[PDB]
C-alpha cells in the first residue's frame, strides 16, 4: 500500500475546494505522531484502490513532499447522495 | 358559529441592559432590569426590590463573569 500526496498551500477558498472535488481529488489532513499538521490532497480512485486492498484498518505508506509516513485512516466524511468521499483524516502511527 | 378562547396578552416590560460596558454613569443610574438575578450586583452596585441593578457611585461600567456560569456588573471610580 502506497499512496502519493500533494501539499495544499494556504487558504483554499470554497470555489477552490469545489473545483478540487470536481476532479478526482479529495481534501485531507495528516496529524499525529512525529509530525505537524499538514493539509494535503489525494486522488479518489487510487485511494479507493489501496483501501480495497489494505482493509479499513491498515497501514499506508503515504508520501508527503519528500518524506514518507506510515499512517492509518482515522475518519472520513461521505456524501450519501452523489456517492463520493469528501474528506479524509490521516493519523501518524509511530 | 365558531369562536376562539384565546385573545389576550399583557403589556411588554422594557427589560434588559440600559447602559453599556465602558460607559461613564452618574450616581443612581439603572444598569439592568430583570426578573430574578440573571446578573448579580458586583462592586459599587446595588440591587433594588424588583431586582433592578443600579450604580452607587460615578464611574465606568464593567460586565464580567462571576463563576463558571454567572455574571455581575461593577462600577469603578476614576474616570
Amino acid at each position: 500500500a502506497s499512496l502519493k500526496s500533494i501539499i495544499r498551500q494556504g487558504k483554499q477558498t470554497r470555489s477552490d475546494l469545489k473545483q478540487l472535488r470536481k476532479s478526482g481529488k479529495v481534501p485531507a489532513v495528516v496529524y499525529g505522531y512525529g509530525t505537524k499538521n499538514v493539509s494535503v490532497k489525494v486522488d479518489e480512485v487510487e485511494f479507493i484502490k489501496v483501501i480495497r486492498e489494505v482493509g479499513r484498518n491498515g497501514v499506508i505508506e503515504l508520501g508527503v513532499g519528500s518524506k514518507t509516513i506510515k499512517v492509518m485512516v482515522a475518519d472520513y466524511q461521505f456524501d450519501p447522495l452523489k456517492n463520493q468521499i469528501t474528506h479524509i483524516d490521516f493519523l501518524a502511527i509511530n | 358559529v365558531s369562536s376562539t378562547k384565546n385573545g389576550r396578552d399583557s403589556e411588554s416590560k422594557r427589560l434588559g441592559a440600559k447602559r453599556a460596558d465602558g460607559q461613564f454613569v452618574t450616581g443612581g443610574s439603572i444598569l439592568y432590569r430583570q426578573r430574578g438575578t440573571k446578573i448579580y450586583p458586583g462592586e459599587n452596585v446595588g440591587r433594588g426590590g424588583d431586582d433592578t441593578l443600579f450604580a452607587k457611585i460615578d464611574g465606568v461600567v464593567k460586565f464580567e463573569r462571576k463563576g463558571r456560569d454567572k455574571k455581575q456588573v461593577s462600577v469603578y471610580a476614576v474616570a
Binding site: 479507493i48 483501501i51 480495497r52 450519501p80 447522495l81 | 365558531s2 376562539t4
Partner: protein, 137 residues
C-alpha cells in the same frame, strides 16, 4: 394508523421544508433501504399503504423497519367557510422528509426480492426514491 398517544399541543406551526436531511442518512438496522431524493410530507396513510404493499410481497420472510414516524399534527377547516375565525381541527399526522433520509429497511431476503419489494412500495409515496445498500469503505 401511526400516531402519538399524546402531545403537549394539538395545533402546531407547519414544518420547514427547505434544506437537506438532518439525520438518519444511513442503513443501520437491515441491509437494504429506500433513500429519498426530493422533499415532501408523508401523511401516515401513505406509510401504512406502502408498508402493506411491501410486506405482502416478501411473504412474511424478512423483517421491515420504518425509520419515519409522523409526529406533527396538521389542521383543516370545515367545508370552505370564510377566512379567519380561529384555527381549525386536527385532521392528520405528517413526517417531513428531505433528500437523503432513509425511509424503510429490509433484511433477511435476497437482493433481488428486496429490490422488487422496495420498488413496489415506492409507487405509493409522493417522493422520488433510490435503492441503496449498507455502506462500506
Amino acid at each position: 394508523m401511526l400516531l402519538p398517544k399524546r402531545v403537549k399541543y394539538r395545533r402546531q406551526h407547519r414544518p420547514k421544508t427547505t434544506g437537506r436531511s438532518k439525520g438518519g442518512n444511513y442503513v443501520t438496522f437491515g441491509e437494504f433501504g429506500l433513500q429519498a431524493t426530493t422533499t415532501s410530507w408523508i401523511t401516515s396513510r401513505q406509510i401504512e399503504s406502502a408498508r402493506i404493499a411491501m410486506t405482502r410481497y416478501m411473504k412474511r420472510g424478512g423483517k421491515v423497519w420504518i425509520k419515519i414516524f409522523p409526529h406533527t399534527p396538521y389542521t383543516k377547516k370545515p367545508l370552505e367557510v370564510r377566512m379567519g375565525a380561529g384555527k381549525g381541527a386536527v385532521e392528520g399526522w405528517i413526517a417531513v422528509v428531505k433528500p437523503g433520509r432513509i425511509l424503510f429497511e429490509v433484511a433477511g431476503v435476497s437482493e433481488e426480492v428486496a429490490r422488487e419489494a422496495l420498488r413496489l412500495a415506492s409507487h405509493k409515496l409522493p417522493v422520488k426514491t433510490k435503492f441503496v445498500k449498507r455502506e462500506e469503505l
